Amino acid sequence: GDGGRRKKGGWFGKHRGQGGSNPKFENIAEGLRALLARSHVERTTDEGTWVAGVFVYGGSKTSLYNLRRGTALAIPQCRLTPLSRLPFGMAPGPGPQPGPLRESIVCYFMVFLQTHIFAEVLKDAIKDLVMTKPAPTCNIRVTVCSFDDGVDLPPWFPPMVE
Amino acid sequence: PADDPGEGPSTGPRGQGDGGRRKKGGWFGKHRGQGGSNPKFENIAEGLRALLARSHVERTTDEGTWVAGVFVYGGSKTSLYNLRRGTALAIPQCRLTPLSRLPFGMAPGPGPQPGPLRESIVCYFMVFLQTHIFAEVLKDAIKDLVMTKPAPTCNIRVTVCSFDDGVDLPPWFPPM
Amino acid sequence: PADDPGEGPSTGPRGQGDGGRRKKGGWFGKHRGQGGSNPKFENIAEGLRALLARSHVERTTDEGTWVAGVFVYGGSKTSLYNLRRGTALAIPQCRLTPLSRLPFGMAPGPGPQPGPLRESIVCYFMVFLQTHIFAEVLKDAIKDLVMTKPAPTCNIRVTVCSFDDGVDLPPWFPPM
Amino acid sequence: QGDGGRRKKGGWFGKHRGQGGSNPKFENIAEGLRALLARSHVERTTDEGTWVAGVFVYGGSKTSLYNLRRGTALAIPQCRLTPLSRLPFGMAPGPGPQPGPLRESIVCYFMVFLQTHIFAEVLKDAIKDLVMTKPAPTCNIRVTVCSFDDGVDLPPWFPPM
DNA sequence: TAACCCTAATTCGATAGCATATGCTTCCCGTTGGGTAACATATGCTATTGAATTAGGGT
DNA sequence: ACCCTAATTCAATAGCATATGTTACCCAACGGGAAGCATATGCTATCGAATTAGGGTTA
């Protein structure tokens, strides 16, 4: 089972985005934190503009979700996107090409970082931990997404809670 | 005859019939990644391709690698979805992703910032483009059309995306 | 009511409408050069203003010479008149010539060429501006706007006009 | 009485816009314009068949403007003429607010479409000389060369029948 | 001797009627678009969990 | 030399939730049409009043 070793699931609240540090995610975050410690760089820009992004992709949803949870704990000064699936690539050699809407089962998640320098550092760290993983986690891949305009993440989220 | 056609022992807007039998969810067969070219979508596609014609550019790359892309965001889920469908019809040589929600941006001022895992209601959409030059042209066309369109559509914002090593989309398999 | 005057006129839901009465016909209190803001023209003006906003430029000059000009020809008289009225609302610092008819162009082949006095049905209106800088932006806005329009509006063609001497419009001293 | 007791044209002549004949008076005006334009010989319309040049005319009086237009047509059939129209009002002088863009004016105007800018300039100079020599409101007539960067595409269609 | 009439010629105004176009206004009806009830289709979140794999490690 | 025994780390593994895909209709806005009205050209005629000389005095 799960929560009770017998329930094997249920409604535990924790709505999408309500992630919490757990031994597994904390360990992943700890490893990523050590890799981030490798390079000393700022995370929050003065203008606080998310002009850089860490596009994680490939691997497996189980590996990606754990990496995403760990990345959040490892980097409090950043933003993460819910796992999404890449669209189909191209038909091999000759044959009918897939439609633009056509998407593959491959999952992915991009990490919004206001600074490009730290975005590069995070991408390197993610690769290091992903490579270290001997499980089907090394399959995970990441690419830098440089937003020239700079993705305008909603700079709200006030102390709305009473 | 989903409650709509004239007369009939049902419908509603035209003819007799109390109705109640209208757009009843039952799965339209088409799965995620495959959708029909709706007249509105192709109509939007016509405007997009018209603005694309304003700046004729290559629509594909010899490598075929989607190393370039564009980021669509803001506006509204319905508007973003309609734009995505129209973009697919207007730009056949592109790869589109299902609409997703952006994370919450930095909290205003020194106020406690949102966790690096929060999910803002803002929805975003990605367009993979092998040709970077076409990416800016497409974004400019989207901006011009969105600007000419009403405020809700005008709310939609688009910015070109650059992948450092590109995105290795999985090789598509032609169905048996 | 005022919008629907008559039991069965061409005004209103047309309920119990035998035909039409005091609907669109009638002599309004208006004259050439005398016009009022119209929501249709207002919406057109709003789009033009947004396109002009893309490149904010000088719209008036110290000399105020109407050396700058534009040639809005083609499309349909209805579309041309609507665009002209909207341009007036969008651009206060401008002068709109009454809609006129272009003459026929060279007759293709050796076919008898049309006379200079010969005038084609094609209608066109010219806009006077104090600075050409705004003229080009205005023309670009009009062209971009008509392109989005699937109506004959897209058929309308606009080319900036240049007056070396600069048309000397009569000073508006008459009022008071 | 269209010639006779009153001897003053009255009724429907059966003529239509563009049906301008070689009126001897207009032909004399055309003769003057012809002599003036004859001084500077230049192709009126090139093989491109593109009306990129224009000869905006205005000022003076509708009678003077129409007479000049009729003469211009007889003098130059290659060019294309436009029906007389009313210019819009100009900037309001003094602190008084300027008039609306729609606001027009009594001043009438007509532009001469030409494929050659050089000939368009020659036509302006010739018209100006004729306007100057005529001390009537014809002298009040004002003319300017309205060049078209793109080149107005006057419907290049053969007049059928 | 030039400077006068004068007195009609003159030629462009300044008139004389028709019947296309235009300008402002008004109803309107396609028209484009967002938007929403309803199957299927994705992941967030927790938790076990089990397992193939990574060793273990001194007998 | 390899035997249980960790073990382990994270995928997988459920039940919850939520968020998106692909389509049917409803109501949305907006701009080209249209109709009637002064409103004004084209063309041509004829016709007016300055011109525009014509000329013939006289000294």
JSON list of N, CA and C in Angstrom, two decimals, chain B residues 121-175:
[
{"chain": "B", "resi": 121, "resn": "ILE", "atom": "N", "xyz": [-1.75, 30.52, -12.65]},
{"chain": "B", "resi": 121, "resn": "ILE", "atom": "CA", "xyz": [-2.88, 30.17, -13.56]},
{"chain": "B", "resi": 121, "resn": "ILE", "atom": "C", "xyz": [-2.47, 30.47, -15.00]},
{"chain": "B", "resi": 122, "resn": "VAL", "atom": "N", "xyz": [-1.53, 31.40, -15.19]},
{"chain": "B", "resi": 122, "resn": "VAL", "atom": "CA", "xyz": [-1.11, 31.80, -16.57]},
{"chain": "B", "resi": 122, "resn": "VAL", "atom": "C", "xyz": [-0.80, 30.54, -17.38]},
{"chain": "B", "resi": 123, "resn": "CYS", "atom": "N", "xyz": [-1.39, 30.41, -18.57]},
{"chain": "B", "resi": 123, "resn": "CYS", "atom": "CA", "xyz": [-1.12, 29.23, -19.44]},
{"chain": "B", "resi": 123, "resn": "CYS", "atom": "C", "xyz": [-0.11, 29.62, -20.52]},
{"chain": "B", "resi": 124, "resn": "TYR", "atom": "N", "xyz": [0.78, 28.68, -20.89]},
{"chain": "B", "resi": 124, "resn": "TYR", "atom": "CA", "xyz": [1.82, 28.97, -21.90]},
{"chain": "B", "resi": 124, "resn": "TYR", "atom": "C", "xyz": [1.80, 27.90, -22.99]},
{"chain": "B", "resi": 125, "resn": "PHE", "atom": "N", "xyz": [2.30, 28.23, -24.18]},
{"chain": "B", "resi": 125, "resn": "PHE", "atom": "CA", "xyz": [2.31, 27.27, -25.32]},
{"chain": "B", "resi": 125, "resn": "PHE", "atom": "C", "xyz": [3.64, 27.39, -26.06]},
{"chain": "B", "resi": 126, "resn": "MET", "atom": "N", "xyz": [4.18, 26.27, -26.55]},
{"chain": "B", "resi": 126, "resn": "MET", "atom": "CA", "xyz": [5.50, 26.29, -27.23]},
{"chain": "B", "resi": 126, "resn": "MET", "atom": "C", "xyz": [5.35, 25.91, -28.70]},
{"chain": "B", "resi": 127, "resn": "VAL", "atom": "N", "xyz": [6.13, 26.54, -29.58]},
{"chain": "B", "resi": 127, "resn": "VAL", "atom": "CA", "xyz": [6.11, 26.19, -31.03]},
{"chain": "B", "resi": 127, "resn": "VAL", "atom": "C", "xyz": [7.54, 25.87, -31.48]},
{"chain": "B", "resi": 128, "resn": "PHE", "atom": "N", "xyz": [7.83, 24.59, -31.73]},
{"chain": "B", "resi": 128, "resn": "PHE", "atom": "CA", "xyz": [9.18, 24.19, -32.21]},
{"chain": "B", "resi": 128, "resn": "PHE", "atom": "C", "xyz": [9.34, 24.60, -33.67]},
{"chain": "B", "resi": 129, "resn": "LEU", "atom": "N", "xyz": [10.41, 25.33, -33.99]},
{"chain": "B", "resi": 129, "resn": "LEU", "atom": "CA", "xyz": [10.66, 25.77, -35.38]},
{"chain": "B", "resi": 129, "resn": "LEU", "atom": "C", "xyz": [12.12, 25.49, -35.75]},
{"chain": "B", "resi": 130, "resn": "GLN", "atom": "N", "xyz": [12.34, 24.67, -36.78]},
{"chain": "B", "resi": 130, "resn": "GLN", "atom": "CA", "xyz": [13.72, 24.34, -37.23]},
{"chain": "B", "resi": 130, "resn": "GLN", "atom": "C", "xyz": [14.41, 25.64, -37.68]},
{"chain": "B", "resi": 131, "resn": "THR", "atom": "N", "xyz": [13.66, 26.53, -38.34]},
{"chain": "B", "resi": 131, "resn": "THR", "atom": "CA", "xyz": [14.24, 27.80, -38.85]},
{"chain": "B", "resi": 131, "resn": "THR", "atom": "C", "xyz": [14.06, 28.90, -37.80]},
{"chain": "B", "resi": 132, "resn": "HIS", "atom": "N", "xyz": [15.17, 29.46, -37.30]},
{"chain": "B", "resi": 132, "resn": "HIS", "atom": "CA", "xyz": [15.11, 30.56, -36.30]},
{"chain": "B", "resi": 132, "resn": "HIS", "atom": "C", "xyz": [14.54, 31.82, -36.95]},
{"chain": "B", "resi": 133, "resn": "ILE", "atom": "N", "xyz": [14.95, 32.12, -38.18]},
{"chain": "B", "resi": 133, "resn": "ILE", "atom": "CA", "xyz": [14.48, 33.36, -38.87]},
{"chain": "B", "resi": 133, "resn": "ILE", "atom": "C", "xyz": [12.95, 33.35, -38.91]},
{"chain": "B", "resi": 134, "resn": "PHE", "atom": "N", "xyz": [12.36, 32.21, -39.27]},
{"chain": "B", "resi": 134, "resn": "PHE", "atom": "CA", "xyz": [10.89, 32.10, -39.35]},
{"chain": "B", "resi": 134, "resn": "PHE", "atom": "C", "xyz": [10.29, 32.31, -37.95]},
{"chain": "B", "resi": 135, "resn": "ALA", "atom": "N", "xyz": [11.02, 31.92, -36.90]},
{"chain": "B", "resi": 135, "resn": "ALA", "atom": "CA", "xyz": [10.49, 32.04, -35.52]},
{"chain": "B", "resi": 135, "resn": "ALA", "atom": "C", "xyz": [10.12, 33.50, -35.23]},
{"chain": "B", "resi": 136, "resn": "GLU", "atom": "N", "xyz": [11.04, 34.43, -35.50]},
{"chain": "B", "resi": 136, "resn": "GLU", "atom": "CA", "xyz": [10.78, 35.87, -35.22]},
{"chain": "B", "resi": 136, "resn": "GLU", "atom": "C", "xyz": [9.62, 36.33, -36.10]},
{"chain": "B", "resi": 137, "resn": "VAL", "atom": "N", "xyz": [9.62, 35.94, -37.38]},
{"chain": "B", "resi": 137, "resn": "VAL", "atom": "CA", "xyz": [8.53, 36.34, -38.31]},
{"chain": "B", "resi": 137, "resn": "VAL", "atom": "C", "xyz": [7.20, 35.84, -37.73]},
{"chain": "B", "resi": 138, "resn": "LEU", "atom": "N", "xyz": [7.17, 34.57, -37.29]},
{"chain": "B", "resi": 138, "resn": "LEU", "atom": "CA", "xyz": [5.92, 33.99, -36.74]},
{"chain": "B", "resi": 138, "resn": "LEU", "atom": "C", "xyz": [5.50, 34.79, -35.50]},
{"chain": "B", "resi": 139, "resn": "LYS", "atom": "N", "xyz": [6.45, 35.05, -34.59]},
{"chain": "B", "resi": 139, "resn": "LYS", "atom": "CA", "xyz": [6.14, 35.80, -33.35]},
{"chain": "B", "resi": 139, "resn": "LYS", "atom": "C", "xyz": [5.59, 37.18, -33.72]},
{"chain": "B", "resi": 140, "resn": "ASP", "atom": "N", "xyz": [6.25, 37.86, -34.66]},
{"chain": "B", "resi": 140, "resn": "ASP", "atom": "CA", "xyz": [5.81, 39.22, -35.08]},
{"chain": "B", "resi": 140, "resn": "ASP", "atom": "C", "xyz": [4.39, 39.13, -35.64]},
{"chain": "B", "resi": 141, "resn": "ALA", "atom": "N", "xyz": [4.13, 38.13, -36.49]},
{"chain": "B", "resi": 141, "resn": "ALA", "atom": "CA", "xyz": [2.77, 37.95, -37.05]},
{"chain": "B", "resi": 141, "resn": "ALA", "atom": "C", "xyz": [1.78, 37.74, -35.91]},
{"chain": "B", "resi": 142, "resn": "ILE", "atom": "N", "xyz": [2.13, 36.87, -34.95]},
{"chain": "B", "resi": 142, "resn": "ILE", "atom": "CA", "xyz": [1.23, 36.61, -33.79]},
{"chain": "B", "resi": 142, "resn": "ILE", "atom": "C", "xyz": [0.96, 37.93, -33.08]},
{"chain": "B", "resi": 143, "resn": "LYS", "atom": "N", "xyz": [2.02, 38.71, -32.81]},
{"chain": "B", "resi": 143, "resn": "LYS", "atom": "CA", "xyz": [1.86, 39.99, -32.07]},
{"chain": "B", "resi": 143, "resn": "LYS", "atom": "C", "xyz": [0.95, 40.92, -32.87]},
{"chain": "B", "resi": 144, "resn": "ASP", "atom": "N", "xyz": [1.19, 41.06, -34.17]},
{"chain": "B", "resi": 144, "resn": "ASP", "atom": "CA", "xyz": [0.38, 41.99, -35.01]},
{"chain": "B", "resi": 144, "resn": "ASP", "atom": "C", "xyz": [-1.08, 41.54, -34.98]},
{"chain": "B", "resi": 145, "resn": "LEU", "atom": "N", "xyz": [-1.33, 40.25, -35.25]},
{"chain": "B", "resi": 145, "resn": "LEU", "atom": "CA", "xyz": [-2.72, 39.73, -35.27]},
{"chain": "B", "resi": 145, "resn": "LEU", "atom": "C", "xyz": [-3.34, 39.91, -33.89]},
{"chain": "B", "resi": 146, "resn": "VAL", "atom": "N", "xyz": [-2.60, 39.54, -32.84]},
{"chain": "B", "resi": 146, "resn": "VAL", "atom": "CA", "xyz": [-3.11, 39.65, -31.44]},
{"chain": "B", "resi": 146, "resn": "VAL", "atom": "C", "xyz": [-3.45, 41.12, -31.15]},
{"chain": "B", "resi": 147, "resn": "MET", "atom": "N", "xyz": [-2.56, 42.04, -31.55]},
{"chain": "B", "resi": 147, "resn": "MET", "atom": "CA", "xyz": [-2.78, 43.49, -31.29]},
{"chain": "B", "resi": 147, "resn": "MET", "atom": "C", "xyz": [-4.05, 43.95, -32.02]},
{"chain": "B", "resi": 148, "resn": "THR", "atom": "N", "xyz": [-4.19, 43.59, -33.30]},
{"chain": "B", "resi": 148, "resn": "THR", "atom": "CA", "xyz": [-5.40, 43.98, -34.08]},
{"chain": "B", "resi": 148, "resn": "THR", "atom": "C", "xyz": [-6.63, 43.31, -33.45]},
{"chain": "B", "resi": 149, "resn": "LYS", "atom": "N", "xyz": [-6.44, 42.13, -32.84]},
{"chain": "B", "resi": 149, "resn": "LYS", "atom": "CA", "xyz": [-7.58, 41.40, -32.22]},
{"chain": "B", "resi": 149, "resn": "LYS", "atom": "C", "xyz": [-8.01, 42.12, -30.93]},
{"chain": "B", "resi": 150, "resn": "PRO", "atom": "N", "xyz": [-9.17, 41.78, -30.34]},
{"chain": "B", "resi": 150, "resn": "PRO", "atom": "CA", "xyz": [-9.67, 42.47, -29.14]},
{"chain": "B", "resi": 150, "resn": "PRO", "atom": "C", "xyz": [-8.74, 42.32, -27.94]},
{"chain": "B", "resi": 151, "resn": "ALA", "atom": "N", "xyz": [-9.03, 43.03, -26.84]},
{"chain": "B", "resi": 151, "resn": "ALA", "atom": "CA", "xyz": [-8.16, 43.00, -25.65]},
{"chain": "B", "resi": 151, "resn": "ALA", "atom": "C", "xyz": [-7.87, 41.56, -25.22]},
{"chain": "B", "resi": 152, "resn": "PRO", "atom": "N", "xyz": [-8.88, 40.67, -25.05]},
{"chain": "B", "resi": 152, "resn": "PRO", "atom": "CA", "xyz": [-8.63, 39.31, -24.56]},
{"chain": "B", "resi": 152, "resn": "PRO", "atom": "C", "xyz": [-7.55, 38.65, -25.43]},
{"chain": "B", "resi": 153, "resn": "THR", "atom": "N", "xyz": [-7.70, 38.74, -26.76]},
{"chain": "B", "resi": 153, "resn": "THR", "atom": "CA", "xyz": [-6.68, 38.18, -27.68]},
{"chain": "B", "resi": 153, "resn": "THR", "atom": "C", "xyz": [-5.40, 39.02, -27.56]},
{"chain": "B", "resi": 154, "resn": "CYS", "atom": "N", "xyz": [-5.55, 40.34, -27.43]},
{"chain": "B", "resi": 154, "resn": "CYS", "atom": "CA", "xyz": [-4.37, 41.24, -27.32]},
{"chain": "B", "resi": 154, "resn": "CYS", "atom": "C", "xyz": [-3.58, 40.87, -26.06]},
{"chain": "B", "resi": 155, "resn": "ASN", "atom": "N", "xyz": [-4.26, 40.36, -25.03]},
{"chain": "B", "resi": 155, "resn": "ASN", "atom": "CA", "xyz": [-3.58, 39.97, -23.77]},
{"chain": "B", "resi": 155, "resn": "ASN", "atom": "C", "xyz": [-2.52, 38.92, -24.07]},
{"chain": "B", "resi": 156, "resn": "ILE", "atom": "N", "xyz": [-2.77, 38.06, -25.06]},
{"chain": "B", "resi": 156, "resn": "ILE", "atom": "CA", "xyz": [-1.80, 36.99, -25.43]},
{"chain": "B", "resi": 156, "resn": "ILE", "atom": "C", "xyz": [-0.45, 37.64, -25.73]},
{"chain": "B", "resi": 157, "resn": "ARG", "atom": "N", "xyz": [0.63, 37.09, -25.16]},
{"chain": "B", "resi": 157, "resn": "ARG", "atom": "CA", "xyz": [2.00, 37.62, -25.42]},
{"chain": "B", "resi": 157, "resn": "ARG", "atom": "C", "xyz": [2.86, 36.49, -25.97]},
{"chain": "B", "resi": 158, "resn": "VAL", "atom": "N", "xyz": [3.81, 36.81, -26.85]},
{"chain": "B", "resi": 158, "resn": "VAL", "atom": "CA", "xyz": [4.65, 35.75, -27.48]},
{"chain": "B", "resi": 158, "resn": "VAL", "atom": "C", "xyz": [6.11, 36.21, -27.53]},
{"chain": "B", "resi": 159, "resn": "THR", "atom": "N", "xyz": [7.04, 35.32, -27.18]},
{"chain": "B", "resi": 159, "resn": "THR", "atom": "CA", "xyz": [8.49, 35.65, -27.24]},
{"chain": "B", "resi": 159, "resn": "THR", "atom": "C", "xyz": [9.25, 34.47, -27.85]},
{"chain": "B", "resi": 160, "resn": "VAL", "atom": "N", "xyz": [10.21, 34.75, -28.74]},
{"chain": "B", "resi": 160, "resn": "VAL", "atom": "CA", "xyz": [10.99, 33.66, -29.41]},
{"chain": "B", "resi": 160, "resn": "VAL", "atom": "C", "xyz": [11.80, 32.90, -28.36]},
{"chain": "B", "resi": 161, "resn": "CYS", "atom": "N", "xyz": [11.93, 31.58, -28.51]},
{"chain": "B", "resi": 161, "resn": "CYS", "atom": "CA", "xyz": [12.72, 30.76, -27.56]},
{"chain": "B", "resi": 161, "resn": "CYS", "atom": "C", "xyz": [13.96, 30.21, -28.27]},
{"chain": "B", "resi": 162, "resn": "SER", "atom": "N", "xyz": [15.11, 30.21, -27.58]},
{"chain": "B", "resi": 162, "resn": "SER", "atom": "CA", "xyz": [16.36, 29.67, -28.16]},
{"chain": "B", "resi": 162, "resn": "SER", "atom": "C", "xyz": [16.86, 28.49, -27.32]},
{"chain": "B", "resi": 163, "resn": "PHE", "atom": "N", "xyz": [16.90, 27.29, -27.90]},
{"chain": "B", "resi": 163, "resn": "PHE", "atom": "CA", "xyz": [17.43, 26.11, -27.17]},
{"chain": "B", "resi": 163, "resn": "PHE", "atom": "C", "xyz": [18.94, 26.04, -27.40]},
{"chain": "B", "resi": 164, "resn": "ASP", "atom": "N", "xyz": [19.72, 26.01, -26.32]},
{"chain": "B", "resi": 164, "resn": "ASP", "atom": "CA", "xyz": [21.21, 26.02, -26.44]},
{"chain": "B", "resi": 164, "resn": "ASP", "atom": "C", "xyz": [21.64, 24.87, -27.36]},
{"chain": "B", "resi": 165, "resn": "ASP", "atom": "N", "xyz": [21.17, 23.66, -27.09]},
{"chain": "B", "resi": 165, "resn": "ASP", "atom": "CA", "xyz": [21.55, 22.48, -27.91]},
{"chain": "B", "resi": 165, "resn": "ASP", "atom": "C", "xyz": [20.33, 22.00, -28.70]},
{"chain": "B", "resi": 166, "resn": "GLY", "atom": "N", "xyz": [19.25, 22.78, -28.68]},
{"chain": "B", "resi": 166, "resn": "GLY", "atom": "CA", "xyz": [18.01, 22.36, -29.37]},
{"chain": "B", "resi": 166, "resn": "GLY", "atom": "C", "xyz": [17.25, 21.34, -28.54]},
{"chain": "B", "resi": 167, "resn": "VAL", "atom": "N", "xyz": [16.04, 20.97, -28.98]},
{"chain": "B", "resi": 167, "resn": "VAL", "atom": "CA", "xyz": [15.26, 19.91, -28.27]},
{"chain": "B", "resi": 167, "resn": "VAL", "atom": "C", "xyz": [15.23, 18.66, -29.15]},
{"chain": "B", "resi": 168, "resn": "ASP", "atom": "N", "xyz": [15.72, 17.53, -28.63]},
{"chain": "B", "resi": 168, "resn": "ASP", "atom": "CA", "xyz": [15.76, 16.27, -29.42]},
{"chain": "B", "resi": 168, "resn": "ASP", "atom": "C", "xyz": [14.38, 15.61, -29.39]},
{"chain": "B", "resi": 169, "resn": "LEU", "atom": "N", "xyz": [13.45, 16.11, -30.20]},
{"chain": "B", "resi": 169, "resn": "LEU", "atom": "CA", "xyz": [12.10, 15.48, -30.27]},
{"chain": "B", "resi": 169, "resn": "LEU", "atom": "C", "xyz": [12.26, 14.02, -30.71]},
{"chain": "B", "resi": 170, "resn": "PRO", "atom": "N", "xyz": [11.51, 13.07, -30.12]},
{"chain": "B", "resi": 170, "resn": "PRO", "atom": "CA", "xyz": [11.68, 11.65, -30.44]},
{"chain": "B", "resi": 170, "resn": "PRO", "atom": "C", "xyz": [11.32, 11.38, -31.91]},
{"chain": "B", "resi": 171, "resn": "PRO", "atom": "N", "xyz": [12.11, 10.58, -32.65]},
{"chain": "B", "resi": 171, "resn": "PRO", "atom": "CA", "xyz": [11.79, 10.24, -34.04]},
{"chain": "B", "resi": 171, "resn": "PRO", "atom": "C", "xyz": [10.36, 9.69, -34.13]},
{"chain": "B", "resi": 172, "resn": "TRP", "atom": "N", "xyz": [9.51, 10.31, -34.95]},
{"chain": "B", "resi": 172, "resn": "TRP", "atom": "CA", "xyz": [8.10, 9.86, -35.09]},
{"chain": "B", "resi": 172, "resn": "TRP", "atom": "C", "xyz": [8.04, 8.51, -35.80]},
{"chain": "B", "resi": 173, "resn": "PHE", "atom": "N", "xyz": [7.09, 7.65, -35.41]},
{"chain": "B", "resi": 173, "resn": "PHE", "atom": "CA", "xyz": [6.92, 6.35, -36.10]},
{"chain": "B", "resi": 173, "resn": "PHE", "atom": "C", "xyz": [5.67, 6.41, -36.98]},
{"chain": "B", "resi": 174, "resn": "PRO", "atom": "N", "xyz": [5.78, 6.23, -38.31]},
{"chain": "B", "resi": 174, "resn": "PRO", "atom": "CA", "xyz": [4.61, 6.20, -39.18]},
{"chain": "B", "resi": 174, "resn": "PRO", "atom": "C", "xyz": [3.73, 5.00, -38.80]},
{"chain": "B", "resi": 175, "resn": "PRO", "atom": "N", "xyz": [2.41, 5.17, -38.63]},
{"chain": "B", "resi": 175, "resn": "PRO", "atom": "CA", "xyz": [1.54, 4.07, -38.19]},
{"chain": "B", "resi": 175, "resn": "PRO", "atom": "C", "xyz": [1.51, 2.94, -39.23]}
]
